[PDB]
Design a protein around this ligand. Structure first.
Ligand code: WCZ
Ligand code: WCZ
Lengths: 304, 304
């Protein structure tokens, strides 16, 4: 019993974190086989950051301009190249701790674990969701750039995020590991706004199913509703519209609890219109939308 | 910016998790040097669990009764002994991944990271607080027993918790690594009740300071109050009384934000009496009490 924001164990990623230094700029890199991946803005000075031409900046560097440290042991850089917004530094030593991995790009509404690092040293682990507007509500200070987000599936690490910057609103933006930004952002020190965000409806429903599995039942009711009449109320409260594919994704949770998806939508409808009246659900006074159906199934018991 | 429930990186503990099997009972153990630590109720069958005599049960075992697996590699048990509610299994191989560690017993109100494991395999990491009534509100299914809670301080792992059981209320109870239970509990399958819980006042105040550091200021006010007049309201809302030592613990946060502790108590007083009026603090609609002052300082920037 219980339900917690739960990250993946971080050991497999901790063994890959290095420190990359160029000039007085130091951030984190990801060391897989004989390649180190880090944000390309490590090659910027304070003036370049305002409007950098990265192709120019990189052409003026050489291998010896890049200090890479794995712990205190220095790594010998033998080649450097740019892929979109990530810098790739070839080193002479393949990382002996390289896990089975792949680079995947995630969809808005999906979750991943973040290993926050500073100066190549991991400091904390937490769970994040990619918001519908392609930002993440992380916890990052100056120097955390190059920290990565990942999921783990049977000892394979799927890296999905590398951290680049904090927007003026305090939310966070970054790229996949091919260097392509999530959302309409660029790596330069200018004020950039994310698009308007929305609540991830399917995750809210998954979390209500988690609550039922755990024995939290007060919000249930006998009412059912239709796909289209619920989506009327979703629009009014800035919730994403619900598709039939979302219902099917929620099938296992609906089957395990015996509560049809469109029955749960009626309870969500009522929660949206009347609130909680001082009560909580799984320890929250708000409707939580950063747990996917997969996150619920992974963490919760298989019997209601 | 941002504030998240943040665990310690779990790699150093992942390398210590093994599987211990006795009969048809399998749980997790902690492998440090040439000793495996696990809950002693691994030696119980289904009938013994109701009212076991562990001294009798252990005397009837021998070394070969204990299957220990580190991955798929089997560990050779060469000795077994009981320390309070933990079983110690000496094995012929010292764990090559043994971190610098120590066994510490924590106080109610302190936090730690939990590495949830099943069948010797880590599955997730999350943050917990030891409640004032010596339970923890974890996320544990059957088979998670033997999972451990820890803090990390400069590559030293302080183990503070080993998981034993879930109470009827769904909260969790366990021991320190010397086998001594937190709280008035015993390892037998009987219904046991925790004492009445209370809200950790000093942590709530630390979290309000985290909110100010992050730029969440709506709940502040110009009022101040006294230690004793606030403790009048703490009692009414089932909050722990505030001591002068708690104020001193909060000094650094009070100094960094410029908001005296007894000024923040006035804001907490108002939050307790009027609520939030639809607003949130660091993404919560409730007053959060599972972040210590140390947790805030560790995660938050050093400049407000
Ligand atoms: C309810 N509350 C919520 C919190 N609200 C407060 C939030 C206050 N937030 C800030 O002021 C952050 C600032 C915003 C900004 C952005 C642009 C710009 F022109 C002007 C300003 N952004 C930064 O300074 C950016 C500037 C930058 C540098 C390089 C690149 Cl390629 C791109 C950018 Cl955009 N720097 C970083 O991202 C650091 N690489 C890593 C870093 C540095 C410092 C702090 C965090 C990080 C991280 N992570 C108050 C209400
Ligand atoms: C708002 N919601 C919140 C959630 N509410 C629902 C909560 C429902 N919770 C339960 O029913 C859990 C049950 C309670 C119980 C306890 C005693 C007793 F006599 C009778 C019942 N406890 C167990 O069955 C205990 C029984 C036990 C075995 C060995 C020992 Cl030495 C001590 C004990 Cl006490 N077993 C475990 O602890 C497993 N070792 C590991 C384990 C097994 C199963 C599930 C979880 C875990 C873990 N972790 C509903 C309202």
């Amino acid at each position: 019993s219980g339900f917690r924001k739960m990250a993946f164990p971080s050991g497999k990623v901790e063994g890959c974190m290095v420190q990359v230094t160029c000039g007085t700029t130091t951030l984190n890199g990801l060391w897989l086989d004989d390649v180190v991946y880090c944000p390309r803005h490590v090659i910027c000075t304070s003036e370049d950051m305002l409007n950098p031409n990265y192709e120019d900046l990189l052409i003026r560097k050489s291998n010896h301009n890049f200090l890479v440290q794995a712990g205190n042991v220095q790594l010998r850089v033998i080649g450097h190249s740019m892929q979109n917004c990530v810098l790739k530094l070839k080193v002479d030593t393949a990382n002996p701790k390289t896990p089975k991995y792949k680079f995947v790009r995630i969809q808005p509404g999906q979750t991943f674990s973040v290993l926050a690092c500073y100066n190549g040293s991991p400091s904390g682990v937490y769970q994040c969701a990619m918001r519908p507007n392609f930002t993440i509500k992380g916890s990052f200070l100056n120097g955390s750039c190059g920290s990565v987000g990942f999921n783990i599936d049977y000892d394979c690490v799927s890296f999905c995020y590398m951290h680049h910057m904090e927007l003026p609103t305090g939310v966070h933006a970054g790229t996949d590991l091919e260097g392509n930004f999530y959302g309409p952002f660029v790596d330069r020190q200018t004020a950039q706004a994310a698009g308007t965000d929305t609540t991830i409806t399917v995750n809210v429903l998954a979390w209500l199913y988690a609550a039922v599995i755990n024995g939290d039942r007060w919000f249930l009711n006998r009412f059912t509703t239709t796909l289209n009449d619920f989506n009327l109320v979703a629009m009014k409260y800035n919730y994403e519209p619900l598709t039939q594919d979302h219902v099917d994704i929620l099938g296992p949770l609906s089957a395990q609890t015996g509560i049809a998806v469109l029955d749960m939508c009626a309870s969500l409808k009522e929660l949206l219109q009347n609130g909680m009246n001082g009560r909580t659900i799984l320890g929250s006074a708000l409707l939580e939308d950063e747990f996917t159906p997969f996150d619920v199934v992974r963490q919760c018991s298989g019997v209601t």
